[model samples]
Target chain A: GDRINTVRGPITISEAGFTLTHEHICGSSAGFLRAWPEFFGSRKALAEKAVRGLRRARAAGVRTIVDVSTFDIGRDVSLLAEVSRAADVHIVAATGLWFDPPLSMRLRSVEELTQFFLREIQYGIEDTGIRAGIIKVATTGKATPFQELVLKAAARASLATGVPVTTHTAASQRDGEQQAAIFESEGLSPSRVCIGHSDDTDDLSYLTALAARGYLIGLDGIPWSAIGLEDNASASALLGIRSWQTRALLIKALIDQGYMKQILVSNDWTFGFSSYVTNIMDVMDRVNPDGMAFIPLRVIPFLREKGVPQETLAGITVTNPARFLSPTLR
Target chain B: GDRINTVRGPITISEAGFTLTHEHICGSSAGFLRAWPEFFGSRKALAEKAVRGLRRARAAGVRTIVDVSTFDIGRDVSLLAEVSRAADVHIVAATGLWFDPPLSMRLRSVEELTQFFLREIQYGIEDTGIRAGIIKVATTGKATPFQELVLKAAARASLATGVPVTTHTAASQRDGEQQAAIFESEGLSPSRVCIGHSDDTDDLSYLTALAARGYLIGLDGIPWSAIGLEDNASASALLGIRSWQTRALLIKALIDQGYMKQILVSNDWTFGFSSYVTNIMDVMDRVNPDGMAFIPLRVIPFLREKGVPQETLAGITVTNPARFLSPTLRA
Candidate 1:
């Protein structure tokens, strides 16, 4: 089947248009909503807000969003399906653990953890019957031993199910190289893995190295202020270009080097509560005023102004996502 | 008001009878039932099983059951209340973390963790509106730094809410003494704490020391077979009596030494799924045929045969639990 699994079920590859590869619909601690929905002002209210925000992204031409909010970070597939239905956007959910997995998950063996991820990707997440479209794993500045176990399990699950894998990396620490090395050792194709948070660093050689090896680079943390790097004057001086400008230049440079197919861009914005005191959308307004529309509304125009053709921008936004996310590509 | 909190509501201390401390109605991973109730057959079915089990205990004259299954161990207060109403038993739920605290919980400060426990003890668990009656915490053979933080939080919460604290200790490692030291440093009185799993070891000196210091001793984990200590021939030789016989003898010795008011007994039995493949009751059948009735029907008769009087046994079963669990002791 040339189908990609969405929260609403499998859609054709062509249906997954201009996908935001790394983003979140709701990012909070696992089981928090289940335990205390009142803390987030009721689940229904959060769903309505998500629908409103996603509608705006749909208006900006975001046809698809890969919500990389894994189960550890409160990935609610039913809510995702509800929002996807209301907003008329395709939503692909992820399966796998995030950074700082729980004691129960950490106690699980590699084979046990592999079966857990496989269950979600093949069967469903919990009892939602909503299969995940991607395997999301994360690493810190240095990958812990347990993290290596998760990466191996993710690789094995992806190999068994033919689902692509995405990652959360400490890009400033150049963690993507080690992540790629682990994926390589497990015999997973580099093309099937997307090294996320690549835009956190302005290091061209680091970004170029991963892209050259056929790994997709996620310039997903659009608008550097949203990621807490905007005020880094020292980093700005070191990179010569400020961090926000560096993301667009890096995307253009990768495209100029003919690695456009290996580049995926997103705002990595969320539409939910971060804690009892902070609403995530409120934080986004202060840090990411462009929000989820940053890529389609802002980055594309900037690239076009720099003499990149419309066809090339289209490939980066539309065709690259469809190709990278297609299960038939395996 | 000499009242103690039950899952139903607060009841006068005189109403609590034949109390079983340090037991569980359901003991699985946190959020497992909420996330996937079908894995346990259904929440309704599990509740029915719990109700059936609690009814048997109620008929055996067990009036109160302290369900020490904490939030980390799938302590569902709504389910506890449902079973308590159906069986007409007094169920006391707990509100602290267990042995292996989650990473998210481990990251919480002592004060933040204290507030979480206080919320359950003072207000309710989640939105269930059924407040916890006791604060349950645990330690392994040796306490970790995070476990100490949980103990401190448990102590602080107990001081704030006047709810007594119970613990799961690696009794074989004599972990209860260190637990007492921590609680004492936090200014929680020894009478306000119950050091659980005392029957896991046959050490008289260890049990006597805690009981002498005004700490309540939990001779819970009634049947040795249920806790996987029945088949240990080496442990039997070291203790002289087999592990199961040692539990009965330990109870008699505690009572003989004028510590009768400090002893609490229970089966520590559960009536839910342990895993997707194993039903906990099925495991109970092989190791604990008497189930929750082991202490009342079996252990009481054994103590009677050893010339322990009825009134003394009543105090151990009824008054001891009433006195230890009463929040009015402080307020």
Candidate 2:
């Protein structure tokens, strides 16, 4: 079936127009929110602002957004549903675990863990009947014991439910290979996983090796930078992009090598809290303004400026996400 | 049939023996270990150190410890099982969720989550047939959506499988009432839950209100001090003794109020990582020199001085824990 689960419910693959694969309704710091639920004063204001951001993205011709916000990252289906209604765009929610491993989960058997995740995919998340379209798991650094367990469980659930796996990786750590290795060992094909945050580095050979393994490479994280668009709260420009040119070049490097179908792009822009250790909301506000607008207004225009063909741009923006998120095989 | 599951397997209620209601085999900072698994050198050596700590506790007449270390805290069941076998002390390992909610779990239904925890109680944790002796759930402050989800699931798991629920709470926040309320709302009597870390303060009223609610009050977090026993890492003679006396008075007040049977005490000491945020190991090594020994050597002696009877002491140390951990009601 070409049907993919969205916050508004499943939409056909063809109708998943100009989709942004990895984004979020509220990319919250779980610890921060737990510590101070009143950090932002009002939840309604935050939701309203998020709606406005999506409206800007829609105005820029972006139709659907895969809100890859997971449990740890504040995957609020009710809130996401509210935003989708207000924004009038299709938002895909996720149903996989994140970095913060629960001790009970660490004690769970892989089969047991797989059953928990499979429930979300087969039914809907948390009784709202809003199903998760993709399975997302992450590693902050290398694959640790619990991380290995999480990856294996995600793989098993994907194979059983035929839903694809998307991942958050430390690009500098080059841990995507570890992800592929573990996924392969668990009897999963490379095509079943999307190796996210690959564009965080300009390491072409690393990207090339990952693509050769048959996994889709994520050239996501387009418009984000350490320097905020509105504020100088963050001075460490070297931490992320000083400009989007570096990201564009990395995409160009991959496309030039004829690995076009293997690419997916989107901003990992968070609408809510950022760091659990520190307050990074002011910085998030400036860096992640109108995230859906990035691809349409900024990224595509730059690609055309760099003399890239229009079809390849469509492949990264449209065709690639359609195929990557589409449930083609079990 | 009143069997309490331990890392070594099930033991009849009598065999639970001199149990410390709250303790740890390894209290870990998962981020450090996950970031650098080889951070503190060999994993084997860390285990050996943990074994030595347990052996010390066992030698000091501590027969069983509810190893309350959870997932985020580095609850290694295999390691706990290995230590239990070698140390010859019963380690009742835990099976429940802990800390900063994972996105996947937050999205799960309470029934779905209850089933997930029940598997560990009915079967075993991970691939180890070492069935969890208890269900542990924690909250940093008050209950959030996910914490509420976790607490409700734990209550349901307890009702279904008869495993007692232990919790990690912020006494300053007085979150135990919130925990008790949720558990009660889920049809669990307050007797099925242990409200942990109530000794961080000397507030008798707060402790009294919790006991009045029919929940077990945990005076855990023993064997720690503001004054370092070894070096001048912490030179506050006033800080160490002042804090110690506050804890002592709190326990004394609880006992005085005839809530001795409702009281449980132990050092919530971690043999592994101490500081969840920064490096407090140098201080931990000095403060927690004998986490198990402190109760036997110091606290018990102090309580005796304060006119606590031997029978009352046994109730706090042994009988209370045996009942608190034993399978209650269901099935």
Candidate 3:
């Protein structure tokens, strides 16, 4: 069992269960403490179903999950811990800002931002025993001045805690390059950052170019075809895995052209109450009624067929994610 | 007419008739020196036909082409001038090297190559012309030590001669980055460079990024299929064009977020020699017909229907290419 760290306290993954890299164990908001009391209405009530989820997960072979939700949104440590203990699964969590455009106003200076991050490191992300497992930042729009500031903070925290960073980019690749460009320019080594949702464009050339520059290009959108919309989102997921399939070609290009180790895939599926996240649990099942689902049955198998060696799969799905989870803190 | 001065010497775009921006014209390899006698045998007889094509171009309202045939392999100005005189078409030629991969095999000292390029620029590209319209360079199998050097030299020549640059990136969404990276690193802003066939990749982000950088992202691939062995190559061509429909959206994004002065468009059609060069001619029959027809007919209609405003259309077809044909000398 790995140790689990809460935004507030500490714990361990000594529990047993399946791990979903992305999940919504706690709430997110601008005023986290104030929002926590009101949004959850009572911190204790938030974990009611989370406990059931954890117990069920441990019963199933999942040992850990990395929850990459950030601060200034709705990061609830108490709920994370309750869920971790309830599910008996190790939860690796993160701390940072939300995307730029919708970002709650922040008056803090760069030093203050760093202090905020360090404070979370000391006190935990929330009330439970879990601490942040990674740093997070976001691009609310195509490279706003605000997003650049967020990246600076994420970089500073990454230096201090050695936690990786994640971000929210425009859904349609609106800020993919701008995001990567900003992160790279901030002096944070790209291998430590996952430029979020590069798969938004589903174009191989786009994905590969970002990869070449050294950022962990994310392609985590699971296929969902909502009624009335084309749900071309499946193309997003497919292109994501396909890019992985071409990993060898890129590795050769990078190594041949001179680039360092690259960070690869992770499923950033947040279990929201609605939207793409809501469908996370049942989405794969719904898509694969024929016994071959998007995750266990489909996305994974196609990757294997497409030459994502079993080892790489294990790394992306398990080991790499485990690296983000903390043991002593949780 | 633009002052087309990239080849052997200073020549005017007035001499350019029925030109094609993309064409090999001479050699698939440096072996052109060998095939020269075989292909042209004796340069004496064909000059007349060349003149006929030029006169026909004038008759057809095609005055300038920016003939992108070759930079180095067939950059035989001695022979090119003969053909130019007979045809009345200014062969806006080019110079540079092609990359041959498998590592250690291909090699050239960078300085030596630069000097060689300088010589070519001074002597001109086609025998009759002053030099090239656009400095031509190429990569073989994703560019090697050799190709990178050629690119650097092309950049230098472009700087010195005030010539814009175009390139030959082989099949695959290959070499777009390296090309841009090399150009920028070599102190050449990509605005003076055209990244060729960037449309072949499923991901067009490379193009957007390049276009954002102020370079012409060449969607020069033919509508016929051939890239990636998938419908992808042709599809990407259409992709490039359709995305162009939203050029306004992209332009807006750039204006709002970043660069705004970097967009330009062209079909990059070639003429003669290649199947496309001829097919476009046949199909584009406002007066006659060919197998697939011409871009000016089918593709232009869409560009118009796509709401491409007149200023933009003229810029892509005229102003933009004029800069390629004769920027330094014209201005």
lDDT-sorted candidate list, best first: 1, 2, 3
Please, what are the lDDT tens digits per residue for candidate 1 over residues B1-331? 3777888998888888789987888777665565556545778888888888788888899999999988768677888888899999999888898864444566667877887788788778888778888989999878888889989998988887788999988888999989999999999999899898888787899999898899999888767553353464433332223456678788999988988888888887887744323333464556666679888888888889999998888888888888888884453
For candidate 2, the docking band is: incorrect
Comparing 1 with 3 on lDDT, the higher-scoring candidate is: 1
Q: In candidate 3 chain B, what residue range of length 10 has the lowest lDDT sum?
A: B270-279
Which tens-of-lDDT digit does each residue in A18-116 have in candidate 2?
888888876663332322234345577778878998999899878888887666564667888999999999998887778764443454567666866
The regions of model 2 sitting more than 4 angstroms off are A29-37, A227-242, A277-279, B1-331
DockQ of each: 0.26, 0.06, 0.01
Stretches > 4 Å off in candidate 3? A1-20, A26-48, A52-60, A100-105, A126-130, A227-294, A305-307, A322-330, B1-331
Sort every candidate by TM-score, greatest first.
Answer: 1, 2, 3
> What total of clashing residue pairs does each candidate reach?
0, 4, 70
CAPRI band for model 1: acceptable
lDDT of each: 0.80, 0.75, 0.50
Mind giving the per-residue lDDT tens digits that candidate 3 earns over A241-274?
Answer: 3433343343223333333234333344333221
Over A1-330, each residue of candidate 1 has an lDDT whose tens digit, in order, gives 589999889998877878888988887766656555654577888888788878888899888999998776867777888899999999999998898455556656788789778888887877878988999999988999999999999999988888899999888899999999999999999989999988878788998898889999999876755235346454333223344666778888888888988988887787774432333346456656667888888888988999899999998888888878887334
Pairs with backbone N, CA or C atoms under 3 Å apart (clashes), candidate 1: none
Worst 10 residues of 1 chain B by lDDT: B233-242
